[PDB]
């Protein structure tokens, strides 16, 4: 299938309390596989998925040095940024970075990603062409002019089209069923009397991977979108996800309601009922 690799970096300044805290995490699709935290006792890239543990000590050692250098670079960026925005040197600011590659079933690069946000707002993004930038404002234009003059996009293309795609392809091979085969949800309906005239029907989807899923209630085959309470998809803490959809129904009318489940792991879309 189609797959993604993404690195997510968060730098948070704390002027007076030392260098900004740098945290990195790496994902393949919805699976986290690495982390680094500048505030750990011995900062190093650590595994967070079983299938990366096989990578040798030079993998871990290279990546650790890259994160330590990136923490220093981000520290410099935050200084430049408070300067560009004419902000106080006393306050805490956030720099987030998100980069990686989307690849199709053939494992060819579909799209490259390389963007930044300052204080939770879009700042600069590499465009789909991977050769030009979109700056959000005049501050971001300073970064843009510098990175154009330095041919930064050209330097970054190499990683997105090369190492990003080849290491993703590697991780996908080594993850095997964990990354390439969808885990279908375990589904059930529960019934929660509110009074003698109303009851809640709750349709559960548990232990599924990846996160993408659709849950809907239907009354006599008609979608009940207006009257469905749908919780945001949430992590189980074991690399799988959960979701539920609930509808309030008149007592004795339960038989009119069906829950409909769409997920990549199911042989076909499921219809469930109170049973």
């Amino acid at each position: 299938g189609s797959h993604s690799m993404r690195y997510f970096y968060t730098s948070v300044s704390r002027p007076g309390r030392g260098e900004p805290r740098f945290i990195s995490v790496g994902y393949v699709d919805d699976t986290q596989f690495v982390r680094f935290d500048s505030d750990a006792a011995s900062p190093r890239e650590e595994p967070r998925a079983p299938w990366i543990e096989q990578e040798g000590p030079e993998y871990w050692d290279r990546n650790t040095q890259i994160y330590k250098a990136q923490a220093q670079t981000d520290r410099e960026s935050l200084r430049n940024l408070r300067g560009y925005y004419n902000q106080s040197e006393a306050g805490s600011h956030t720099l987030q970075s998100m980069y990686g590659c989307d690849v199709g079933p053939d494992g060819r690069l579909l799209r490259g990603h390389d963007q930044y946000a300052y204080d939770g707002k879009d700042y600069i993004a590499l465009n789909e062409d991977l050769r030009s930038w979109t700056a959000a404002d005049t501050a971001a234009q300073i970064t843009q002019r510098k990175w154009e003059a330095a041919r930064e996009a050209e330097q970054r293309r190499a990683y997105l089209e090369g190492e990003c795609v080849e290491w993703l392809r590697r991780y996908l091979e080594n993850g095997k069923d964990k990354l390439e085969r969808a885990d279908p949800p375990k589904t059930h309906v529960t019934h929660h009397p509110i009074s003698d005239h109303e009851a809640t029907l709750r349709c559960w989807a548990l232990g599924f991977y990846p996160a993408e899923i659709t849950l809907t209630w239907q009354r006599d085959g008609e979608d009940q979108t207006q009257d469905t309470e749908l919780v945001e998809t949430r992590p189980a803490g074991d690399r799988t996800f959960q979701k539920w959809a609930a509808v309030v129904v008149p007592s004795g009318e339960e038989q009119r309601y069906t829950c409909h489940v769409q997920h990549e792991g199911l042989p076909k879309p499921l219809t469930l009922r109170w049973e």
Partner: peptide, 9 residues
């Protein structure tokens, strides 16, 4: 694997 990139904003 993460990229090596030393460019500041």
């Amino acid at each position: 694997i993460p990229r090596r990139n030393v460019a500041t904003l």
